[PDB]
Short mmCIF file of C-alpha atoms in Angstrom, two decimals:
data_model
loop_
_atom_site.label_atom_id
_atom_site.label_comp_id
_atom_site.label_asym_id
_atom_site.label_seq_id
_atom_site.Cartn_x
_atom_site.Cartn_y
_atom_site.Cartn_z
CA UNK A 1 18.11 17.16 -21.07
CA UNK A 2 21.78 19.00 -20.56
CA UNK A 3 21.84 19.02 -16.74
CA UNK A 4 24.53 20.50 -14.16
CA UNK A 5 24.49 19.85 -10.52
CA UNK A 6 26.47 21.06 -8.13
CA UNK A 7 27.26 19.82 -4.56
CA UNK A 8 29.90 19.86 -1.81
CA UNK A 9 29.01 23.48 -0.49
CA UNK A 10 28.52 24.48 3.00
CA UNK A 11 30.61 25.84 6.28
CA UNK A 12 34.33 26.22 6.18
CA UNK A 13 36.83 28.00 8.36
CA UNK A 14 39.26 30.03 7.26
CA UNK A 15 42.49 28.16 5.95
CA UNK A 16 41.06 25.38 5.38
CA UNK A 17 39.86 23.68 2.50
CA UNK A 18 36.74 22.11 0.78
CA UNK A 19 36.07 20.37 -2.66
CA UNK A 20 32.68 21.03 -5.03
CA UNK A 21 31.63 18.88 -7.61
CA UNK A 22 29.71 19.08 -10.06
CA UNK A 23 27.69 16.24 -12.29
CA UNK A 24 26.75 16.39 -15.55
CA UNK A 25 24.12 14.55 -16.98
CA UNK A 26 21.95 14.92 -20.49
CA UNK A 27 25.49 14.98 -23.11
CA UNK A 28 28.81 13.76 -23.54
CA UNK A 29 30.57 15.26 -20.70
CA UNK A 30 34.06 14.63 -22.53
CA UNK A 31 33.03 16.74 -25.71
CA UNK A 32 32.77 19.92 -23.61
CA UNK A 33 35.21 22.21 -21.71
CA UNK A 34 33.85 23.57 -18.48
CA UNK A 35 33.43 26.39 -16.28
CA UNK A 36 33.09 27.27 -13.04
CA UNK A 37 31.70 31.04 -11.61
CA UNK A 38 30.55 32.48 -8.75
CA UNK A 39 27.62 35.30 -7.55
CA UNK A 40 27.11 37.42 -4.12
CA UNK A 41 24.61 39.64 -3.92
CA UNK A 42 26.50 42.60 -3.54
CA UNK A 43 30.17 41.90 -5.93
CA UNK A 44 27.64 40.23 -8.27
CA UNK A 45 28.99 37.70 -11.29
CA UNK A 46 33.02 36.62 -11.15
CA UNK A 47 34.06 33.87 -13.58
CA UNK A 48 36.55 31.67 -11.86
CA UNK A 49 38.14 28.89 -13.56
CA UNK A 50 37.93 27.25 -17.41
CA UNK A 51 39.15 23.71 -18.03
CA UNK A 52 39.63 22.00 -21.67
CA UNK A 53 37.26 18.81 -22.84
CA UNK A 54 39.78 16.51 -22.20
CA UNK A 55 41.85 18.78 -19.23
CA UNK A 56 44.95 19.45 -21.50
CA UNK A 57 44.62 22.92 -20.47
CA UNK A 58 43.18 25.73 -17.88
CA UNK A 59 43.18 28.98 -16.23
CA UNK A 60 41.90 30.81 -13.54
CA UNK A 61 40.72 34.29 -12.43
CA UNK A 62 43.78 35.82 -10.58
CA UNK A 63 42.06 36.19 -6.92
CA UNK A 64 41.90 32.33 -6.70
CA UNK A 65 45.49 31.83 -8.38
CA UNK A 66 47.63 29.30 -6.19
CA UNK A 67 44.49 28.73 -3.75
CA UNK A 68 41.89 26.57 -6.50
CA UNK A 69 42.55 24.13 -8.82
CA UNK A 70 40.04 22.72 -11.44
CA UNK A 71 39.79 19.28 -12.74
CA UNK A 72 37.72 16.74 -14.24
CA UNK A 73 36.99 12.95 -14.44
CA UNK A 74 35.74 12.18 -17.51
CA UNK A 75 34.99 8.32 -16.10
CA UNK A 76 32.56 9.99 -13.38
CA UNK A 77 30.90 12.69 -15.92
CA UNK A 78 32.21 15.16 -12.89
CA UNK A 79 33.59 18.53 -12.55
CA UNK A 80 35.67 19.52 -9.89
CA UNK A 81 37.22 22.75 -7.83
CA UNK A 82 39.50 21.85 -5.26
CA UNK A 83 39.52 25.12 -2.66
CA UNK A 84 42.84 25.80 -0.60
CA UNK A 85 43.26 28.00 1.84
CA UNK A 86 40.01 29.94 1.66
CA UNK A 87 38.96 33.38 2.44
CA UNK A 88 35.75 35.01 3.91
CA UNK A 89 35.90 36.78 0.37
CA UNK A 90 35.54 33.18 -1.44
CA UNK A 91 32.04 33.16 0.39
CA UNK A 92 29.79 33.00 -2.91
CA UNK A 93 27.23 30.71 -4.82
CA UNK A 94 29.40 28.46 -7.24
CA UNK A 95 27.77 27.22 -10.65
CA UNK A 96 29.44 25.09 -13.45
CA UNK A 97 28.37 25.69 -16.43
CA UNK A 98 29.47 24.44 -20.09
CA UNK A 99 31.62 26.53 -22.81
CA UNK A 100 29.66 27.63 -25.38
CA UNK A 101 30.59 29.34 -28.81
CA UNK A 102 29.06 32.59 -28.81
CA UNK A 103 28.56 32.82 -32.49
CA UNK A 104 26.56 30.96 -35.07
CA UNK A 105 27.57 27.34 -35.23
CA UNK A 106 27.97 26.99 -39.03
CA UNK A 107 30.17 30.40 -39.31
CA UNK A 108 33.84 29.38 -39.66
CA UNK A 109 36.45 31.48 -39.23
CA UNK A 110 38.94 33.95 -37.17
CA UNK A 111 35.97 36.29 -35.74
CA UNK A 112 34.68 33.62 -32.79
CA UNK A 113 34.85 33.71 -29.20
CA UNK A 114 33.79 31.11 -26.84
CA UNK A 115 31.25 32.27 -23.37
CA UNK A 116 29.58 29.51 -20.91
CA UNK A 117 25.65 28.64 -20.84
CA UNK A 118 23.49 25.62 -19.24
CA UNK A 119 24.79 26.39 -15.64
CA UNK A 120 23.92 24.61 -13.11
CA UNK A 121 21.65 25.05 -9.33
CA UNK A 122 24.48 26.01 -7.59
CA UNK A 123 26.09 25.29 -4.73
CA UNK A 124 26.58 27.73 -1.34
CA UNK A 125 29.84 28.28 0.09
CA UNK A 126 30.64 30.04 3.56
CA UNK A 127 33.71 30.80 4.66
CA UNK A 128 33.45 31.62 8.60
CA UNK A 129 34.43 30.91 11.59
CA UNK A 130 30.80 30.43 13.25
CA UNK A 131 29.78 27.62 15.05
CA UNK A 132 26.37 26.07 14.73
CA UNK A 133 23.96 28.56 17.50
CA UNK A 134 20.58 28.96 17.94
CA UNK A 135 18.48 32.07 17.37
CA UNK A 136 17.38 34.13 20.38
CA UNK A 137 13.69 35.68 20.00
CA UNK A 138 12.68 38.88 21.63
CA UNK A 139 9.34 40.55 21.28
CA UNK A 140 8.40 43.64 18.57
CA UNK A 141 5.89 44.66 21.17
CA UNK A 142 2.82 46.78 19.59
CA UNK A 143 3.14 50.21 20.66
CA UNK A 144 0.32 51.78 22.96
CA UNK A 145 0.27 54.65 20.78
CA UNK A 146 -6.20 51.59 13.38
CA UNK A 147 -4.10 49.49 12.42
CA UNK A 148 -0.90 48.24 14.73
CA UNK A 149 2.36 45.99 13.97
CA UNK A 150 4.05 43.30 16.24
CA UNK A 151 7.35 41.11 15.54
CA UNK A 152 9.86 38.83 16.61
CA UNK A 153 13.57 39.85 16.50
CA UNK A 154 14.98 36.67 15.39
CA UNK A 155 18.99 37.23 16.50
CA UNK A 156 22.46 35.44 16.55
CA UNK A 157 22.20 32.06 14.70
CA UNK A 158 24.07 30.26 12.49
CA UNK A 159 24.06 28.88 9.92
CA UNK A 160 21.05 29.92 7.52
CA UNK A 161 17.93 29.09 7.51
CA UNK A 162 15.57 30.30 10.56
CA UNK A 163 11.50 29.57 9.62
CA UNK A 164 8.97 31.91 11.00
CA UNK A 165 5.37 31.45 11.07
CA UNK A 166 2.78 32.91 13.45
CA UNK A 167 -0.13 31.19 15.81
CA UNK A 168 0.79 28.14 13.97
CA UNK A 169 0.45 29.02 10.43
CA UNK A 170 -2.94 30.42 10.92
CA UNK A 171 -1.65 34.14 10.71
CA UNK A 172 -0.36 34.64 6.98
CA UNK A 173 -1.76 37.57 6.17
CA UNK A 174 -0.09 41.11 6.66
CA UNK A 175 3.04 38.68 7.70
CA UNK A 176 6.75 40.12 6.79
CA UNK A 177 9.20 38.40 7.16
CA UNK A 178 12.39 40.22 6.30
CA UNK A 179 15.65 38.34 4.75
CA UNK A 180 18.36 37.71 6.91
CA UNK A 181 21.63 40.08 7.60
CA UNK A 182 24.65 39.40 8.35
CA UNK A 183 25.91 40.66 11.82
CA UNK A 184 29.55 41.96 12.45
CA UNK A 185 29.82 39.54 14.57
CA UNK A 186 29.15 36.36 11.96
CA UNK A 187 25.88 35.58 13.13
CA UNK A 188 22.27 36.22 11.73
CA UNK A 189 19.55 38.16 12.47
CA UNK A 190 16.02 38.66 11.29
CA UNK A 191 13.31 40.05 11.99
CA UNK A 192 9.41 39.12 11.35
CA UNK A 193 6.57 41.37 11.47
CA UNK A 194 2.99 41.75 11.10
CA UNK A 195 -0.08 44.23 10.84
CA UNK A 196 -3.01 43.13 12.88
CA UNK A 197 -6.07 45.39 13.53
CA UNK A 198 -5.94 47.39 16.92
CA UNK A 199 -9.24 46.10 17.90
CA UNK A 200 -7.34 42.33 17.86
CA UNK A 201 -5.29 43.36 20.55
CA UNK A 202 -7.90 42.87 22.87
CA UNK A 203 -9.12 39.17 21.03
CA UNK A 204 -6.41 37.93 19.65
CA UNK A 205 -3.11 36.44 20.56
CA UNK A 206 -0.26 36.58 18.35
CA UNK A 207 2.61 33.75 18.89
CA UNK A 208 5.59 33.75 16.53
CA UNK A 209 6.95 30.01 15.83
CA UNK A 210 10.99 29.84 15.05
CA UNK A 211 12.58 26.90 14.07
CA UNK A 212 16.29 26.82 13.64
CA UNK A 213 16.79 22.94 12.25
CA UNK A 214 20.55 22.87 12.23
CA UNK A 215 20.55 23.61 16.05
CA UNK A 216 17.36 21.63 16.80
CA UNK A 217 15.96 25.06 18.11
CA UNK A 218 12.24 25.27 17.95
CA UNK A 219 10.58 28.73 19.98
CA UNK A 220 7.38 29.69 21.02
CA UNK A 221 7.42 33.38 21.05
CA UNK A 222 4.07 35.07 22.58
CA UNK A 223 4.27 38.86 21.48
CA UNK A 224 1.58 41.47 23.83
CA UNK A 225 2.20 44.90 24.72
CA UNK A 226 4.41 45.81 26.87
CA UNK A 227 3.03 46.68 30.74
CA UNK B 1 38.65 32.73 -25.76
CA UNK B 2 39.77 30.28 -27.52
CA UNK B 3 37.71 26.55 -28.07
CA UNK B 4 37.83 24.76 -24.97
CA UNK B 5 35.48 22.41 -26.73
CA UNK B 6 36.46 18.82 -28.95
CA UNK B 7 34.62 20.73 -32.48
CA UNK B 8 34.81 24.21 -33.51
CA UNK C 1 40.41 44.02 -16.68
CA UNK C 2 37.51 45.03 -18.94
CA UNK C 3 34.88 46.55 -16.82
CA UNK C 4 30.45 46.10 -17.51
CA UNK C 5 28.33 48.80 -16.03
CA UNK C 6 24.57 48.54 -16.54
CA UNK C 7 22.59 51.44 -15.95
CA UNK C 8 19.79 51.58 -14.61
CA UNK C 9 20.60 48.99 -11.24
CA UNK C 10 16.09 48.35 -10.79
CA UNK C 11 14.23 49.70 -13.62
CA UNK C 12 10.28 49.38 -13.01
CA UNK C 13 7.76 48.79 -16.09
CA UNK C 14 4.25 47.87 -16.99
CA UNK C 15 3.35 44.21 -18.75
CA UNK C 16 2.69 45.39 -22.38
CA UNK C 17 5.91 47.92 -22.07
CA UNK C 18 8.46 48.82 -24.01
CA UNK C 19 11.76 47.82 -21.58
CA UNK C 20 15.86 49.12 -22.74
CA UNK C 21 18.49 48.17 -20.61
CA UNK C 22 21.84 49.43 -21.56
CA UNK C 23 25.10 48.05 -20.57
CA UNK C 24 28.87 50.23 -21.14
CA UNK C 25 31.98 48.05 -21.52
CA UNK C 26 35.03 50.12 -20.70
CA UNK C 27 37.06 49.58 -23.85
CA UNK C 28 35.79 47.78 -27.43
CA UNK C 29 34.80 44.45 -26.52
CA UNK C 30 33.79 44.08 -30.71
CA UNK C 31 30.31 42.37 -30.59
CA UNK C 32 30.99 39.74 -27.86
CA UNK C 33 28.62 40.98 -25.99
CA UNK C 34 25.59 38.51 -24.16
CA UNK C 35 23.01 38.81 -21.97
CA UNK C 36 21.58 36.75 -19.43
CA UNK C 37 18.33 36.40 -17.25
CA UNK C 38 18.50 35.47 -13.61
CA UNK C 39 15.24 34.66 -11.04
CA UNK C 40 15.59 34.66 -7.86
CA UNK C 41 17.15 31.31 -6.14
CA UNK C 42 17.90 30.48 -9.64
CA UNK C 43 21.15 30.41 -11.96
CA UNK C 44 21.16 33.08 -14.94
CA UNK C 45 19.78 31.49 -18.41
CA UNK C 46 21.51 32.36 -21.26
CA UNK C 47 19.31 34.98 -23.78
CA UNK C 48 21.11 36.44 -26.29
CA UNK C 49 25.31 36.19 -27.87
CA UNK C 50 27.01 38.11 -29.95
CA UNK C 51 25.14 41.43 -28.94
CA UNK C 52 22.14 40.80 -31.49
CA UNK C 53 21.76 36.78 -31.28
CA UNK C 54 18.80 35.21 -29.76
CA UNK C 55 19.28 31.69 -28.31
CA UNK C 56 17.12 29.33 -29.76
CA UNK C 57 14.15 28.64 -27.26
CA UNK C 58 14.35 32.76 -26.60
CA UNK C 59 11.17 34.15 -27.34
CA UNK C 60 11.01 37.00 -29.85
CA UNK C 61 10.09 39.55 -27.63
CA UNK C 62 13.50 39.98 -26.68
CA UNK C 63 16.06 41.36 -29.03
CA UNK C 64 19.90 43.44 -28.64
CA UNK C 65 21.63 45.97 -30.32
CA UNK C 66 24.82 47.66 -29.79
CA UNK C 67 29.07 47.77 -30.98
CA UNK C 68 31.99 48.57 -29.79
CA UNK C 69 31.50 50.21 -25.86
CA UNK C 70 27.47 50.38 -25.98
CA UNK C 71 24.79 47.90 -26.29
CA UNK C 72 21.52 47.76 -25.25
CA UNK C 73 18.85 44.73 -24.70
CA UNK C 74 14.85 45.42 -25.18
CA UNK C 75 11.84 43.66 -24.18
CA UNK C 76 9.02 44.94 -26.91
CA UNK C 77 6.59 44.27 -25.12
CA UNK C 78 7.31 43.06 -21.41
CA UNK C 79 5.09 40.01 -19.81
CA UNK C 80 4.90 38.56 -16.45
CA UNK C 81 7.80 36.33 -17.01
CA UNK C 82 10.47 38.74 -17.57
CA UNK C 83 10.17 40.48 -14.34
CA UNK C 84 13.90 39.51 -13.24
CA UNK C 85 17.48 40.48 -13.46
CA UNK C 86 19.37 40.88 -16.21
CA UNK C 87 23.15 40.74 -16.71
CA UNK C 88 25.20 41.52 -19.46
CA UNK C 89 28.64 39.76 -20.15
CA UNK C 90 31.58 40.48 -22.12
CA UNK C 91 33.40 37.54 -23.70
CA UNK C 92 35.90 39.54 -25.85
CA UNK C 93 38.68 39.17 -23.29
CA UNK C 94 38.30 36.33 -20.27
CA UNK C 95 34.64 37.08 -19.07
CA UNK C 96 33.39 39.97 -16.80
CA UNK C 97 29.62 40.54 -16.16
CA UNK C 98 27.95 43.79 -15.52
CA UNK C 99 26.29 44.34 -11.99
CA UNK C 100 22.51 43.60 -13.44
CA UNK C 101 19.30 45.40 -13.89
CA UNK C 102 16.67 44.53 -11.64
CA UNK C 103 13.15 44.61 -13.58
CA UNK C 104 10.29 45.03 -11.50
CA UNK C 105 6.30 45.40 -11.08
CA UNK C 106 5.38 49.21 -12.11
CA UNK C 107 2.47 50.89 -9.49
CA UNK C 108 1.75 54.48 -7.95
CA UNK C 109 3.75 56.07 -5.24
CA UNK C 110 2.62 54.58 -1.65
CA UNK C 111 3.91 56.03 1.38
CA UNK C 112 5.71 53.86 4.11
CA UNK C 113 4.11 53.39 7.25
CA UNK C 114 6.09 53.46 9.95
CA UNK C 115 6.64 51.72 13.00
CA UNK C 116 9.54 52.36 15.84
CA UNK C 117 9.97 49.35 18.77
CA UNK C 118 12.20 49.59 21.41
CA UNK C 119 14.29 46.64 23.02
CA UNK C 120 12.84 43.78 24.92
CA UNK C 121 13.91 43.67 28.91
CA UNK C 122 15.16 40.13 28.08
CA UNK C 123 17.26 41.23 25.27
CA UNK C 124 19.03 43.71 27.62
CA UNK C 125 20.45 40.75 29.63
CA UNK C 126 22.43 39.58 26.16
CA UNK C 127 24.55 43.02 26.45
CA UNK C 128 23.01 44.45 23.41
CA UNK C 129 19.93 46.85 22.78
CA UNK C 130 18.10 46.29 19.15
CA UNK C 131 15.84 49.33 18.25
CA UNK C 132 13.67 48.04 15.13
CA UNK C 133 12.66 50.88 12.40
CA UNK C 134 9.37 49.17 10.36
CA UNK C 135 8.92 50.80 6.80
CA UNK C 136 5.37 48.91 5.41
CA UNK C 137 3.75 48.32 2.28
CA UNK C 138 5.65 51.86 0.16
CA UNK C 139 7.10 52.42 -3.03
CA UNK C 140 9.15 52.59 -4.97
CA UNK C 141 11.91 51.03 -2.79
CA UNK C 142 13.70 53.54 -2.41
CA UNK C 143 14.01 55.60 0.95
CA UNK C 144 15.83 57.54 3.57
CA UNK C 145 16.04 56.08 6.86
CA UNK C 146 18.08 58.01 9.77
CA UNK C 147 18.71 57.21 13.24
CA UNK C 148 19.18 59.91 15.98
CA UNK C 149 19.78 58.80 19.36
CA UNK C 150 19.54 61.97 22.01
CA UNK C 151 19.57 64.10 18.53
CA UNK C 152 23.08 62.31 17.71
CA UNK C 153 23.10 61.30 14.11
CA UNK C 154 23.85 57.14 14.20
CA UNK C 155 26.14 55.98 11.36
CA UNK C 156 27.63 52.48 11.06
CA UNK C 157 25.60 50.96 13.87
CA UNK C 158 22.31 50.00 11.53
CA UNK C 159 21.53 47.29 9.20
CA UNK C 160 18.77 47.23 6.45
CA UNK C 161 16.94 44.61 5.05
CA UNK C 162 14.19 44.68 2.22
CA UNK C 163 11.52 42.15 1.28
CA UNK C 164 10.45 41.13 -2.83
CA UNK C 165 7.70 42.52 -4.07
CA UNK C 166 4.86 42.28 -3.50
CA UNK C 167 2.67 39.47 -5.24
CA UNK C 168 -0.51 41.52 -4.37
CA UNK C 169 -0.10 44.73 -4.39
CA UNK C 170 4.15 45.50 -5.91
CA UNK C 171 4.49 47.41 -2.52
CA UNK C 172 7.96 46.86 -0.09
CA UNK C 173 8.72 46.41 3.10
CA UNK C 174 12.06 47.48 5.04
CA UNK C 175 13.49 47.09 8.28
CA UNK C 176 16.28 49.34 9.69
CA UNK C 177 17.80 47.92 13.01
CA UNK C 178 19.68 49.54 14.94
CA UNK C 179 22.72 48.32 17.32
CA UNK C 180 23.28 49.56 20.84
CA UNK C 181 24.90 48.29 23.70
CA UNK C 182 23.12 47.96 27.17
CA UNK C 183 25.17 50.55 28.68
CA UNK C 184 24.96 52.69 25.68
CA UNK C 185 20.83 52.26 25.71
CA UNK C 186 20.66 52.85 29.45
CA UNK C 187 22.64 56.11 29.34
CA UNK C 188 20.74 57.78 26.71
CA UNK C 189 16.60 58.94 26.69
CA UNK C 190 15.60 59.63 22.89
CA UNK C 191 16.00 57.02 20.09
CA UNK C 192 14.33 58.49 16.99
CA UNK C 193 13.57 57.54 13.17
CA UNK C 194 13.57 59.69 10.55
CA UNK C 195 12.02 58.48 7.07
CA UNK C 196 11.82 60.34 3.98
CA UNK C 197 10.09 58.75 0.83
CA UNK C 198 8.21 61.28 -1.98
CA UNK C 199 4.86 59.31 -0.58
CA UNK C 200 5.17 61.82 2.08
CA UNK C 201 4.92 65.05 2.16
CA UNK C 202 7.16 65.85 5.12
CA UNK C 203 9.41 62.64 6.71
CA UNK C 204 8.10 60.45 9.28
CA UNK C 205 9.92 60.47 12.90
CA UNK C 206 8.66 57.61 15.61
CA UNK C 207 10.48 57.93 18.45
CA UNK C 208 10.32 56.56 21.99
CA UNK C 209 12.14 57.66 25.40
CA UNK C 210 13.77 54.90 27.20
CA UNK C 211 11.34 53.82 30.45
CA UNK C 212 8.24 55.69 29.20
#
């Protein structure tokens, strides 16, 4: 099967540089010219970069102009994009995927243009100057004011992902746990919640579990009303 | 866009 | 240089309905014109080229229409797979993609309920005061969230964040937190939250005062 992976994503400061790859497995790598492109959730789809089968020719979007530089090695069925002096604005997903005609193969002739399909996972770059931190967790207490909800304010960690469960994974009902934001100040925060029944205040205890695994941060958070 | 690929 | 706009951003339907999405290029882009379909965590699949192609494996539920500045892409009759985003892309000149249209899980109106929480005493010690605004189980997503602090409007100090779905019952959740600093907290009594949504009749204020 035509398959595209991508890898070499993660942290970078500002400035400085990093290289993704991406391996293609399934066809003849050398018969294809490649792209790559890149998402955020809120600028959405940017193309970035085209290279030729055999590398004779490319181009680029003109934000990365000067700063990226795509390649291939035809010997290692790999893609590459070689990222200099990066921006917090470079932060994105970044897929490879293949050029593709987009018109019917057997139609010959001046009306054709070329698009991309089969992309790949992706691969997550950040551009920041964050340092590896723990989360700190602070009670959503349930008011004193049915049905009640309690939480744990999951703040300032870095990098993505924080886990959440509650009393051990024996609480999944009525659980929300929200998606993480990015703070002003380049750290995380989240926040997880729950609806319990007011009556289980009295019987019940509620104890939200946070592991942070690239800080080796694991929390015990026991969430009661406030006295 | 041109063919970036070896056929048309 | 040649700009996409989908319209609408989150369009909601029923399986078994009838779905258009419709997608504007801002000059003649001929008929290079494709569509793709994107899940979440996953990379967009290619569905349809040269505005009215489908892509072999595509099933025939799908189809596209459209020339010159407007297209459209319809579902005939929409299943549980097709719940996604879709993105339309222009290949006439370089590429450019459209901002997507979010498909989701038609119900009935549901109110929010909500839920104000003041700041911890530990978290006090850490300089900053979070105030947590708890929106449960409403929709459609959709909603009007404001923060008054001693009846002073708060802008630029919040953050939002919105769950999927539903699997159970298509309902969201959303959390509005806001950002204070100790001295700022400890200097004012009244932190308020103010939701509107058409679930409710009238919006929705939990408040607290600081130390009661």
């Amino acid at each position: 099967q035509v398959q595209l992976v991508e890898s070499g994503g993660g942290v970078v400061q500002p400035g400085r540089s990093l290289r993704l790859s991406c391996e293609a497995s399934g066809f003849t790598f050398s018969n294809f010219g490649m792209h790559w492109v890149r998402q955020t959730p809120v600028k959405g789809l940017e193309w970035v970069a085209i290279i030729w089968f055999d590398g004779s020719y490319k181009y680029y979007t003109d934000s990365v102009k000067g700063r990226f530089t795509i390649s291939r090695d035809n010997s290692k069925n790999t893609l590459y994009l070689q990222m200099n002096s990066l921006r917090a604005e470079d932060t994105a997903v970044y897929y490879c995927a293949r050029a593709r005609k987009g018109q019917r193969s057997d139609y010959y002739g001046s009306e054709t243009s070329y698009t991309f399909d089969n992309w790949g996972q992706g691969t997550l770059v950040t551009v920041s100057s964050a340092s590896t931190k723990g989360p700190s967790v602070f009670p959503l207490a349930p008011s004193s004011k049915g049905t009640a909800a309690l939480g744990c304010l999951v703040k300032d960690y870095f990098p993505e992902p924080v886990t959440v469960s509650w009393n051990s994974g024996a609480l999944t009902s009525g659980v929300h746990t929200f998606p993480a934001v990015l703070q002003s100040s380049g750290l995380y925060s989240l926040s997880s919640v729950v609806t319990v029944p007011s009556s289980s205040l009295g019987t019940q205890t509620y104890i939200c579990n946070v592991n942070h695994k690239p800080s080796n941060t694991k929390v015990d958070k026991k969430v009661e009303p406030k006295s | 866009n041109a063919n970036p690929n070896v056929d048309p | 240089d040649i700009q996409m706009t989908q319209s609408p951003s989150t369009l909601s339907a029923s399986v078994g309905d009838r779905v258009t999405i419709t997608c504007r290029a801002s000059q003649s882009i001929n008929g290079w014109l494709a569509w793709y379909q994107q899940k979440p965590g996953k990379a967009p699949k290619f569905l349809i080229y040269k505005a009215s192609i489908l892509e072999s494996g595509i099933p025939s539920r799908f189809s596209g229409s459209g020339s010159g500045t407007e297209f459209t892409l319809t579902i005939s009759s929409l299943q549980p797979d097709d719940f996604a985003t879709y993105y339309c892309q222009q290949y006439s000149s370089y590429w450019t993609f459209g901002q997507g249209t979010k498909v989701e899980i038609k119900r009935t109106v549901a109110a929010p309920s909500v839920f104000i929480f003041p700041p911890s005493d530990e978290q006090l010690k850490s300089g900053t005061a979070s105030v947590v605004c708890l929106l449960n189980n409403f929709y459609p997503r959709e909603a009007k969230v404001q923060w008054k602090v001693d009846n002073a409007l708060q802008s630029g100090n919040s953050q939002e964040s919105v769950t999927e779905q539903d699997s159970k019952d298509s309902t969201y959740s959303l959390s509005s937190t806001l950002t204070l600093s100790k001295a700022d907290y400890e200097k004012h009594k009244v932190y308020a939250c103010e939701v509107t949504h058409q679930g409710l009749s009238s919006p929705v204020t939990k408040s607290f005062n600081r130390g009661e």
